[PDB]
Amino acid sequence: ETLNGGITDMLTELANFEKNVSQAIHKYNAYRKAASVIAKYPHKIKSGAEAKKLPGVGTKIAEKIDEFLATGKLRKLEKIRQDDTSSSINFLTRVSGIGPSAARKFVDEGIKTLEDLRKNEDKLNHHQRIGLKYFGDFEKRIPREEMLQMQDIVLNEVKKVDSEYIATVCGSFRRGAESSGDMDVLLTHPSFTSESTKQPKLLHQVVEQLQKVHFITDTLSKGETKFMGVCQLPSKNDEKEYPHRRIDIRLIPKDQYYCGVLYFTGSDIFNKNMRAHALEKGFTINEYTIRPLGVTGVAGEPLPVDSEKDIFDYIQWKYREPKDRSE
DNA sequence: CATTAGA
DNA sequence: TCTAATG
Ligand code: NA
Ligand code: NA
Ligand SMILES: [Zn+2]
Ligand SMILES: [Zn+2]
């Protein structure tokens, strides 16, 4: 956790770079299990030889380890860190819409800088355009203070349209987070469940709504169950116009909201932990459901869930307020 | 791990 | 169709 800190750190830098700059999946894939194994290893690694004892730790990796060990550095790192083509790839990637594929690609043409990205808007697709467009606003953390106003709003129109519209702003803000990266609206309605062959318009109405009011400024993407957008608070009595907020709204079968709500909220650890437990209690927990286990190794039979509660009850646990869904 | 663009 | 990108 801190005993094998650097070791894992460099391993990750190292892993990462393979996978981005070079399209070296495997080397990258190497750097990770190692980076993974060595993480756990309950003893302060003092030589590569020691590491080497490890599963996933080859000769190349340890080579590095010792090097890191001796000199509080690594050449491959100093070289990478330094190197432009690489620096540029990691950079550009920051644009919403820009993964490493396109990243390398642009570089190849020489769109290393941001301005580059500008003169080359033709070269960019829709998302990527909006990426570039709210480049700053996107890097920006969302103050709860605003999460509340937004949420506020979202709730009304959700309502103004149909009263059957059940909606939850999940995520960190759900667990009292003082800020968030983007607001996530978990949405379902009674007419939509496991069975009833969809009803695309259910998601659609609402997109149109928030939009009709100006909350939704743009379309990052929009499917029949998932919509990814840009939103923004009515820049008031002016002199202070709101930053464009990243937003996501997802339509759900009502019959499987909660496991999904549970899910969406996290944290990852409460999850994995809540997830670890269900199993003991003789169950199976998923991004949408909870099934009973059957000694035959496994089982099925998706249980009836009427609240974040029921699920707990199931695995018979203490209801943990979202606020304390911390770990 | 699943959903959406897009080519 | 696959292949990228988000989450
Ligand atoms: Na080994
Ligand atoms: Na990106
Ligand atoms: Zn020890
Ligand atoms: Zn989100």
CSV table of C-alpha atoms (C1' of nucleotides) and ligand atoms in Angstrom, one decimal:
chain,number,residue,atom,x,y,z
A,1,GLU,CA,0.0,0.0,0.0
A,2,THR,CA,3.0,2.2,0.6
A,3,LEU,CA,5.6,-0.5,1.3
A,4,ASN,CA,5.6,-1.4,-2.4
A,5,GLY,CA,4.4,1.9,-3.6
A,6,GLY,CA,6.9,3.1,-6.2
A,7,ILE,CA,7.3,-0.4,-7.4
A,8,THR,CA,3.8,-0.6,-8.4
A,9,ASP,CA,3.8,3.0,-9.5
A,10,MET,CA,6.5,2.8,-12.1
A,11,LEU,CA,4.9,-0.6,-13.3
A,12,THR,CA,1.8,1.2,-14.1
A,13,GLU,CA,3.4,4.2,-15.8
A,14,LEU,CA,5.4,1.5,-17.6
A,15,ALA,CA,2.3,-0.6,-18.3
A,16,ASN,CA,0.3,2.3,-19.5
A,17,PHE,CA,2.8,3.7,-21.9
A,18,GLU,CA,3.2,0.4,-23.7
A,19,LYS,CA,-0.5,0.2,-24.3
A,20,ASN,CA,-0.8,3.9,-25.5
A,21,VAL,CA,2.4,5.0,-27.3
A,22,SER,CA,3.2,1.6,-28.7
A,23,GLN,CA,0.3,-0.7,-29.4
A,24,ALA,CA,1.9,-3.3,-27.0
A,25,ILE,CA,-1.0,-4.9,-25.2
A,26,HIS,CA,1.0,-7.9,-23.8
A,27,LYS,CA,3.9,-5.9,-22.4
A,28,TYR,CA,1.3,-3.7,-21.0
A,29,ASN,CA,-0.6,-6.7,-19.9
A,30,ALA,CA,2.6,-7.9,-18.2
A,31,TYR,CA,3.4,-4.7,-16.4
A,32,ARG,CA,0.1,-5.1,-14.7
A,33,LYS,CA,-0.3,-8.5,-13.2
A,34,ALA,CA,3.2,-7.8,-11.8
A,35,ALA,CA,2.2,-4.3,-10.8
A,36,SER,CA,-0.8,-6.2,-9.4
A,37,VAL,CA,1.0,-9.1,-7.6
A,38,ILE,CA,3.8,-7.0,-6.2
A,39,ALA,CA,1.0,-4.7,-4.8
A,40,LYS,CA,-0.2,-7.2,-2.3
A,41,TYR,CA,3.2,-8.8,-1.5
A,42,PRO,CA,3.3,-8.1,2.2
A,43,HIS,CA,6.9,-7.5,2.4
A,44,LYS,CA,9.1,-4.6,1.5
A,45,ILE,CA,10.7,-5.8,-1.8
A,46,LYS,CA,14.5,-5.3,-1.5
A,47,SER,CA,15.8,-6.6,-4.7
A,48,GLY,CA,14.4,-7.7,-8.0
A,49,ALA,CA,15.5,-11.2,-7.1
A,50,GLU,CA,13.0,-11.0,-4.3
A,51,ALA,CA,10.3,-9.7,-6.7
A,52,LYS,CA,11.3,-12.2,-9.2
A,53,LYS,CA,10.1,-14.9,-6.9
A,54,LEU,CA,6.8,-13.6,-7.9
A,55,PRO,CA,4.3,-14.9,-10.2
A,56,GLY,CA,4.2,-12.6,-13.2
A,57,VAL,CA,7.6,-11.2,-12.5
A,58,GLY,CA,10.0,-12.0,-15.2
A,59,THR,CA,13.5,-11.1,-15.7
A,60,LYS,CA,12.7,-7.9,-17.6
A,61,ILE,CA,10.5,-6.5,-14.9
A,62,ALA,CA,13.1,-7.2,-12.1
A,63,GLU,CA,15.7,-5.6,-14.2
A,64,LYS,CA,13.7,-2.6,-13.8
A,65,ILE,CA,12.9,-3.1,-10.2
A,66,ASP,CA,16.6,-3.3,-9.2
A,67,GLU,CA,17.3,-0.2,-11.3
A,68,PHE,CA,14.5,1.6,-9.5
A,69,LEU,CA,15.8,0.2,-6.3
A,70,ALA,CA,19.4,1.4,-6.7
A,71,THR,CA,18.9,4.8,-8.3
A,72,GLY,CA,15.7,6.6,-7.3
A,73,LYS,CA,14.8,6.6,-11.0
A,74,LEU,CA,14.5,4.6,-14.2
A,75,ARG,CA,15.9,5.4,-17.6
A,76,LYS,CA,13.0,4.1,-19.7
A,77,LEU,CA,10.9,6.3,-17.5
A,78,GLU,CA,13.2,9.4,-17.7
A,79,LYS,CA,13.3,8.8,-21.5
A,80,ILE,CA,9.4,8.3,-21.9
A,81,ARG,CA,8.5,11.1,-19.5
A,82,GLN,CA,10.7,13.4,-21.5
A,83,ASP,CA,9.7,12.3,-25.1
A,84,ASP,CA,7.2,14.4,-27.0
A,85,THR,CA,5.4,11.9,-29.3
A,86,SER,CA,4.5,10.1,-26.1
A,87,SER,CA,3.7,13.3,-24.1
A,88,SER,CA,1.5,14.4,-26.8
A,89,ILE,CA,-0.4,11.2,-27.0
A,90,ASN,CA,-1.2,11.3,-23.3
A,91,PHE,CA,-2.2,14.9,-23.6
A,92,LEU,CA,-4.7,14.9,-26.4
A,93,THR,CA,-6.3,12.0,-24.9
A,94,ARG,CA,-7.8,14.4,-22.4
A,95,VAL,CA,-10.3,15.5,-24.9
A,96,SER,CA,-13.6,13.9,-24.5
A,97,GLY,CA,-13.9,11.7,-27.5
A,98,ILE,CA,-10.2,11.2,-27.9
A,99,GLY,CA,-8.9,7.8,-27.0
A,100,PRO,CA,-5.5,6.5,-27.8
A,101,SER,CA,-6.4,5.4,-31.3
A,102,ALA,CA,-7.2,8.7,-32.6
A,103,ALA,CA,-4.5,10.2,-30.4
A,104,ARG,CA,-1.7,8.4,-32.1
A,105,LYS,CA,-3.3,9.1,-35.3
A,106,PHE,CA,-3.5,12.9,-34.9
A,107,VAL,CA,0.0,12.9,-33.9
A,108,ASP,CA,1.0,11.2,-37.0
A,109,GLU,CA,-0.5,14.0,-39.0
A,110,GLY,CA,1.0,16.2,-36.4
A,111,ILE,CA,-1.9,17.4,-34.3
A,112,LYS,CA,0.1,17.4,-31.2
A,113,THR,CA,-1.1,20.7,-29.6
A,114,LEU,CA,-4.6,22.0,-28.8
A,115,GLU,CA,-4.6,24.8,-31.3
A,116,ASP,CA,-3.8,22.0,-33.7
A,117,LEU,CA,-7.0,20.5,-32.7
A,118,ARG,CA,-8.6,23.7,-33.6
A,119,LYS,CA,-7.3,24.3,-37.0
A,120,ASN,CA,-8.2,20.8,-37.6
A,121,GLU,CA,-11.7,20.7,-36.5
A,122,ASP,CA,-12.7,19.0,-39.7
A,123,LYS,CA,-10.6,16.1,-38.6
A,124,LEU,CA,-12.7,15.8,-35.4
A,125,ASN,CA,-16.1,14.1,-35.2
A,126,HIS,CA,-19.2,15.4,-33.1
A,127,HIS,CA,-18.2,14.3,-29.6
A,128,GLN,CA,-14.6,15.4,-30.2
A,129,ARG,CA,-15.9,18.7,-31.3
A,130,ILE,CA,-17.8,19.2,-28.2
A,131,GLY,CA,-14.8,17.8,-26.3
A,132,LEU,CA,-12.6,20.5,-27.7
A,133,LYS,CA,-15.3,23.0,-27.2
A,134,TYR,CA,-15.7,22.5,-23.3
A,135,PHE,CA,-12.1,21.4,-22.9
A,136,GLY,CA,-11.6,23.4,-19.8
A,137,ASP,CA,-15.2,23.0,-18.3
A,138,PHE,CA,-14.8,19.4,-18.7
A,139,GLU,CA,-11.8,19.2,-16.5
A,140,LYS,CA,-13.5,21.1,-13.9
A,141,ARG,CA,-14.9,19.5,-10.8
A,142,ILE,CA,-18.6,20.2,-10.1
A,143,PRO,CA,-19.3,21.9,-6.7
A,144,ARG,CA,-22.1,20.2,-4.8
A,145,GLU,CA,-23.6,23.6,-4.4
A,146,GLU,CA,-24.5,23.4,-8.2
A,147,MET,CA,-25.2,19.6,-8.1
A,148,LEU,CA,-28.1,20.6,-5.9
A,149,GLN,CA,-29.4,23.2,-8.3
A,150,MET,CA,-29.1,21.1,-11.2
A,151,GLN,CA,-30.6,18.1,-9.5
A,152,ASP,CA,-33.3,20.4,-8.4
A,153,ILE,CA,-34.2,21.3,-11.9
A,154,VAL,CA,-33.9,17.9,-13.3
A,155,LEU,CA,-36.4,16.7,-10.9
A,156,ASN,CA,-39.2,19.0,-12.0
A,157,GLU,CA,-39.2,18.5,-15.6
A,158,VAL,CA,-38.8,14.8,-14.9
A,159,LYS,CA,-41.9,15.3,-13.1
A,160,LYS,CA,-43.6,17.9,-15.3
A,161,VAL,CA,-43.6,15.4,-18.1
A,162,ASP,CA,-45.0,12.3,-16.4
A,163,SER,CA,-45.6,11.7,-12.8
A,164,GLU,CA,-44.5,8.1,-13.1
A,165,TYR,CA,-40.9,9.4,-13.7
A,166,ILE,CA,-38.7,8.1,-10.9
A,167,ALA,CA,-35.3,9.7,-10.9
A,168,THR,CA,-32.1,9.6,-9.0
A,169,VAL,CA,-28.9,11.6,-9.2
A,170,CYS,CA,-26.6,8.8,-8.1
A,171,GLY,CA,-22.8,8.7,-7.8
A,172,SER,CA,-20.6,10.6,-5.3
A,173,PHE,CA,-23.0,13.4,-4.7
A,174,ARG,CA,-25.4,10.6,-3.6
A,175,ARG,CA,-22.9,9.6,-0.9
A,176,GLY,CA,-22.6,13.4,0.2
A,177,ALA,CA,-19.6,14.1,-2.1
A,178,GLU,CA,-18.5,17.7,-1.9
A,179,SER,CA,-18.1,17.7,-5.7
A,180,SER,CA,-18.4,15.4,-8.6
A,181,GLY,CA,-17.0,15.0,-12.1
A,182,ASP,CA,-20.4,14.7,-13.8
A,183,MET,CA,-24.0,14.4,-12.7
A,184,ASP,CA,-25.5,10.9,-13.3
A,185,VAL,CA,-29.3,10.6,-13.6
A,186,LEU,CA,-30.5,7.0,-12.9
A,187,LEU,CA,-33.9,6.8,-14.5
A,188,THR,CA,-36.9,4.3,-14.8
A,189,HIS,CA,-40.5,4.3,-15.0
A,190,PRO,CA,-43.4,1.8,-14.3
A,191,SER,CA,-44.3,1.3,-17.8
A,192,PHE,CA,-40.7,0.0,-18.5
A,193,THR,CA,-39.6,-3.3,-17.0
A,194,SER,CA,-37.6,-6.5,-17.7
A,195,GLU,CA,-40.2,-7.7,-20.3
A,196,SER,CA,-42.2,-4.8,-22.1
A,197,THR,CA,-40.1,-4.5,-25.3
A,198,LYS,CA,-38.8,-1.1,-24.5
A,199,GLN,CA,-40.5,2.2,-25.3
A,200,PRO,CA,-37.6,4.5,-26.6
A,201,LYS,CA,-39.7,7.5,-26.2
A,202,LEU,CA,-39.5,7.1,-22.4
A,203,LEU,CA,-35.9,8.3,-22.5
A,204,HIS,CA,-36.7,10.6,-25.4
A,205,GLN,CA,-39.3,12.7,-23.9
A,206,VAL,CA,-37.1,13.9,-21.1
A,207,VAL,CA,-34.1,14.6,-23.3
A,208,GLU,CA,-36.4,16.9,-25.2
A,209,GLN,CA,-37.5,18.4,-22.0
A,210,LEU,CA,-34.4,19.5,-20.4
A,211,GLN,CA,-33.4,20.5,-23.7
A,212,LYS,CA,-36.6,22.6,-24.2
A,213,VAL,CA,-35.6,24.5,-21.2
A,214,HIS,CA,-31.9,24.9,-21.9
A,215,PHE,CA,-30.5,22.6,-19.4
A,216,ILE,CA,-29.3,20.3,-22.0
A,217,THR,CA,-27.2,22.2,-24.3
A,218,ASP,CA,-25.8,19.4,-26.5
A,219,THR,CA,-25.8,15.8,-27.6
A,220,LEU,CA,-22.7,13.8,-26.8
A,221,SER,CA,-24.6,10.7,-27.6
A,222,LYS,CA,-28.1,9.4,-27.5
A,223,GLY,CA,-29.4,5.9,-27.7
A,224,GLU,CA,-32.6,4.5,-26.7
A,225,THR,CA,-31.6,3.9,-23.1
A,226,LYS,CA,-28.5,5.9,-22.6
A,227,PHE,CA,-28.0,9.6,-23.4
A,228,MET,CA,-24.7,11.3,-22.8
A,229,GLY,CA,-24.8,15.2,-22.9
A,230,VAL,CA,-23.6,18.6,-21.8
A,231,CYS,CA,-25.7,20.7,-19.5
A,232,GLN,CA,-25.4,24.0,-17.8
A,233,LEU,CA,-27.0,26.3,-15.2
A,234,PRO,CA,-28.8,29.3,-16.4
A,235,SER,CA,-26.3,31.9,-16.3
A,236,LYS,CA,-28.2,34.1,-13.9
A,237,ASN,CA,-28.2,37.9,-13.5
A,238,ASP,CA,-25.1,37.6,-15.6
A,239,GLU,CA,-21.5,38.3,-14.9
A,240,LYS,CA,-21.2,34.7,-13.9
A,241,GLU,CA,-22.1,32.1,-16.7
A,242,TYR,CA,-22.0,28.4,-15.7
A,243,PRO,CA,-19.5,26.0,-16.8
A,244,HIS,CA,-20.8,23.3,-19.1
A,245,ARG,CA,-21.5,20.2,-17.2
A,246,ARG,CA,-21.0,16.7,-18.4
A,247,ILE,CA,-24.2,14.7,-18.0
A,248,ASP,CA,-25.6,11.1,-18.3
A,249,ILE,CA,-29.1,9.8,-18.2
A,250,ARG,CA,-30.2,6.2,-18.3
A,251,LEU,CA,-33.5,4.6,-18.6
A,252,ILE,CA,-34.2,1.6,-16.6
A,253,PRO,CA,-36.7,-1.3,-16.2
A,254,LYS,CA,-38.4,-0.4,-13.1
A,255,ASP,CA,-38.1,-4.0,-12.0
A,256,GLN,CA,-34.4,-3.6,-11.7
A,257,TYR,CA,-33.7,0.0,-10.6
A,258,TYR,CA,-32.3,-0.5,-7.1
A,259,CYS,CA,-29.6,-3.1,-7.8
A,260,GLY,CA,-28.7,-0.6,-10.5
A,261,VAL,CA,-29.1,2.4,-8.1
A,262,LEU,CA,-27.1,0.5,-5.5
A,263,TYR,CA,-24.7,-0.1,-8.1
A,264,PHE,CA,-24.3,3.3,-9.6
A,265,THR,CA,-23.8,4.9,-6.2
A,266,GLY,CA,-20.9,2.7,-5.1
A,267,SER,CA,-18.5,3.2,-3.9
A,268,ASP,CA,-16.5,0.6,-5.6
A,269,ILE,CA,-15.5,-0.7,-2.2
A,270,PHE,CA,-18.9,-0.6,-0.7
A,271,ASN,CA,-19.8,-2.5,-3.7
A,272,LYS,CA,-17.2,-5.1,-3.9
A,273,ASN,CA,-17.8,-5.4,-0.1
A,274,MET,CA,-21.5,-5.5,-0.4
A,275,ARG,CA,-20.7,-7.8,-3.2
A,276,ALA,CA,-18.4,-9.9,-1.3
A,277,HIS,CA,-21.0,-10.4,1.5
A,278,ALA,CA,-24.1,-11.3,-0.6
A,279,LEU,CA,-22.2,-14.4,-1.6
A,280,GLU,CA,-21.6,-15.6,2.0
A,281,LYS,CA,-25.3,-15.0,2.8
A,282,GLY,CA,-25.9,-17.4,-0.2
A,283,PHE,CA,-26.3,-14.9,-3.0
A,284,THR,CA,-25.4,-13.2,-6.2
A,285,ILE,CA,-25.2,-9.4,-6.8
A,286,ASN,CA,-25.1,-7.6,-10.2
A,287,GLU,CA,-25.3,-4.2,-11.9
A,288,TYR,CA,-29.0,-4.9,-12.1
A,289,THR,CA,-29.9,-7.8,-9.9
A,290,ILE,CA,-29.8,-10.3,-6.9
A,291,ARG,CA,-30.2,-14.0,-7.2
A,292,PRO,CA,-30.1,-16.8,-4.7
A,293,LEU,CA,-27.3,-19.2,-4.8
A,294,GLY,CA,-27.7,-22.9,-5.2
A,295,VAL,CA,-25.2,-25.4,-3.8
A,296,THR,CA,-24.8,-27.0,-7.3
A,297,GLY,CA,-21.9,-24.6,-7.6
A,298,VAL,CA,-24.3,-21.8,-8.9
A,299,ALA,CA,-28.0,-20.9,-9.4
A,300,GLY,CA,-30.5,-18.3,-10.7
A,301,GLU,CA,-33.9,-17.0,-9.9
A,302,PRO,CA,-33.9,-13.1,-9.8
A,303,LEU,CA,-35.4,-11.8,-6.5
A,304,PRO,CA,-38.1,-9.2,-6.0
A,305,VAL,CA,-36.5,-5.8,-5.1
A,306,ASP,CA,-38.7,-2.8,-3.9
A,307,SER,CA,-35.8,-0.6,-2.5
A,308,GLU,CA,-32.0,-0.3,-1.8
A,309,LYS,CA,-33.3,-1.8,1.4
A,310,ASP,CA,-34.8,-5.1,0.4
A,311,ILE,CA,-31.5,-6.1,-1.2
A,312,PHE,CA,-29.7,-5.4,2.1
A,313,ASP,CA,-32.4,-7.4,4.0
A,314,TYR,CA,-31.9,-10.1,1.6
A,315,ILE,CA,-28.3,-10.4,2.4
A,316,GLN,CA,-29.6,-9.3,5.8
A,317,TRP,CA,-27.4,-6.3,6.4
A,318,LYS,CA,-27.5,-2.9,8.2
A,319,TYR,CA,-28.9,-0.3,5.9
A,320,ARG,CA,-26.0,1.9,5.2
A,321,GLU,CA,-27.0,5.4,4.4
A,322,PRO,CA,-25.6,6.4,1.0
A,323,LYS,CA,-23.6,8.9,2.9
A,324,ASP,CA,-21.6,6.1,4.5
A,325,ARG,CA,-21.4,3.8,1.5
A,326,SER,CA,-17.8,4.7,1.7
A,327,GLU,CA,-16.2,1.2,1.9
B,1,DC,C1',-19.1,-5.1,-20.2
B,2,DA,C1',-22.2,-2.8,-22.4
B,3,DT,C1',-23.8,0.8,-25.1
B,4,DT,C1',-23.3,4.2,-29.0
B,5,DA,C1',-21.0,6.4,-33.3
B,6,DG,C1',-19.0,5.8,-37.4
B,7,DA,C1',-16.8,4.2,-41.2
C,1,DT,C1',-19.7,-5.5,-39.8
C,2,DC,C1',-15.9,-4.1,-36.4
C,3,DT,C1',-13.5,-1.0,-33.9
C,4,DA,C1',-13.3,3.1,-30.9
C,5,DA,C1',-14.8,5.5,-26.9
C,6,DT,C1',-17.2,6.2,-22.4
C,7,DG,C1',-18.3,4.7,-18.3
D,1,NA,NA,8.5,-15.7,-11.0
D,2,NA,NA,-10.4,11.4,-24.0
D,3,ZN,ZN,8.7,-8.7,5.4
D,4,ZN,ZN,-21.5,10.1,-14.9
